[PDB]
Amino acid sequence: RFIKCVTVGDGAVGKTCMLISYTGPTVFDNFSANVVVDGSTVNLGLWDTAGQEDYNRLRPLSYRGADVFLLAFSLISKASYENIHKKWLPELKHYAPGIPIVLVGTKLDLRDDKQFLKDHPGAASITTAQGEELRKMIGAVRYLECSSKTQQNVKAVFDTAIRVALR
């Protein structure tokens, strides 16, 4: 068995940090390792999409033969939230309809940080309920909120991707 898992979404969302977090100057090379799932072993292939948000022609392989997508937005950026439906969904639904999506909300440590939000008035916190609306809207298989700093739910994210890509 072989799984291709691709992290997609805007810039400054933490795509690469999430992956560096999960596994281990922010550089994530294509990574592949054996993991056991409920009995037998699968080969997990993780793909970063960093830079695509800036120039689409940068990453031609992003969508090809993908088994599961992690759509990621920042919990402190409403623009990143809007783009999940305005920009990223039309792409995956063009190149790979019917491939499962896992909604990931990053920067969980910053969301209720009253101090940080005061310091960066432009940043704006997305609620869980708001992330669930977004899950049901883009037909994502599951919504999870995580943090690279903290590491909360990060494994839960990939555990979901792994499980869903073997359906």
């Binding site: 550089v27 960093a50 800036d54 689409n56 031609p60 960066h120 008035p121």
Partner: protein, 329 residues
């Protein structure tokens, strides 16, 4: 410069498969991705129109050298002669860099250097500046980029002058790169898995009405396209893929329809110089085992997209200048 290089090279022999089972990718695909990923990390920090900070520059210079350096060893092994001081001519085999690498790699290094050069022309003081995305002044497309600000009542003409000049310089760089990319892609082998995905014949791939248009008595590729819905970039993409699919089939009388289709392809390139890569392009890259072409294609690709980042970042200032003038006359 040891424990740093070592890692990079070793991660490549695993072919992405860190279990060491060699269920990884080809040494070529591993190299294509390594280059792609490195450019994203370095270029992603270039959010402002200013020189690349000395250490990022150093990282870039040395890391890419490592990855590009495999091409030094890709050779043509050909017969030649040599002649000793004593006078004797003996035949030898000899080793010269492969045709498509000799000229193209240094061309791409020139392009690389041209772009780092162009960012360097914004060393020190510029008339435009950047603000924090999340400050007050920041709230006044790609939301992650620090909004650029420009002096009220425009930009000094000598500032606008150089902006336009570098943009042209960069735009000629972008084209240069795209040409090399397109060239590598045309010479990359058509993967066995693509031919298998192909429909039984032309009509099936083209669709009923498209097939009737390309097979009429007279054909005008200008009228043809005007007739079809080209409103979205996804649609042009679908057409290009359908036409491309045909051409592959047919190239296995029917030459008219075949020539007709290739006429459209060229027009598609001309009316849409910006299109994402076709199914075939993707497929070629996906399965390519030729490490030389792997390097040529991805290096040209990241350079195309660096060129674009700079064109993008210039165009911001200019658009911003324009708006501030339109706030008066």
């Amino acid at each position: 410069d040891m424990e740093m290089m070592k890692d990079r090279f070793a991660k490549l022999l695993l072919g992405e498969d860190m279990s060491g089972g060699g269920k990884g990718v080809s040494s070529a695909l591993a190299l294509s991705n390594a280059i792609t990923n490195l450019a994203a990390s370095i270029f992603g920090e270039q959010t402002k129109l200013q020189p690349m900070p000395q250490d990022r520059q150093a990282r870039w210079k040395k890391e890419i050298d490592w990855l590009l350096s495999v091409t030094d060893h890709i050779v043509e092994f050909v017969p030649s002669q040599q002649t000793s001081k004593d006078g004797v001519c003996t035949e030898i085999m000899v080793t010269r860099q492969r045709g498509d690498l000799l000229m193209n790699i240094p061309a791409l290094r020139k392009l690389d250097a041209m772009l780092i050069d162009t960012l360097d022309n914004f060393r020190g003081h510029n008339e435009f500046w950047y603000v924090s995305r999340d400050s007050e002044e920041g709230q006044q497309d790609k939301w992650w980029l620090p909004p650029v600000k420009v002096p009220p009542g425009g930009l000094s003409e000598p500032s606008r002058r150089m902006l336009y000049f570098q943009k042209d310089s960069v735009t000629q760089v972008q084209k240069a790169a795209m040409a090399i990319n397109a060239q590598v892609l045309s010479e990359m082998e058509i993967p066995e898995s693509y031919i298998d995905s192909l429909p039984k014949n032309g009509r099936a791939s083209l669709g009923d009405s498209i097939y009737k248009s390309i097979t009429e008595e007279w054909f005008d590729p200008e009228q043809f396209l005007a007739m079809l819905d080209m409103s979205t970039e996804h649609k042009v993409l679908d057409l290009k893929n359908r036409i491309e699919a045909s051409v592959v089939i047919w190239k296995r009388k029917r030459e008219l329809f075949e020539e007709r289709a290739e006429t459209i392809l060229v027009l598609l390139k001309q009316k849409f110089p910006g299109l994402p890569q076709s199914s075939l392009d993707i497929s070629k890259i996906q399965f390519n085992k030729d490490v030389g072409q792997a390097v040529l294609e991805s290096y040209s690709r990241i350079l195309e997209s660096l060129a674009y980042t700079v064109m993008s970042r210039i165009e911001d200032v200019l658009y911003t200048d324009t708006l501030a003038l339109k706030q008066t006359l």
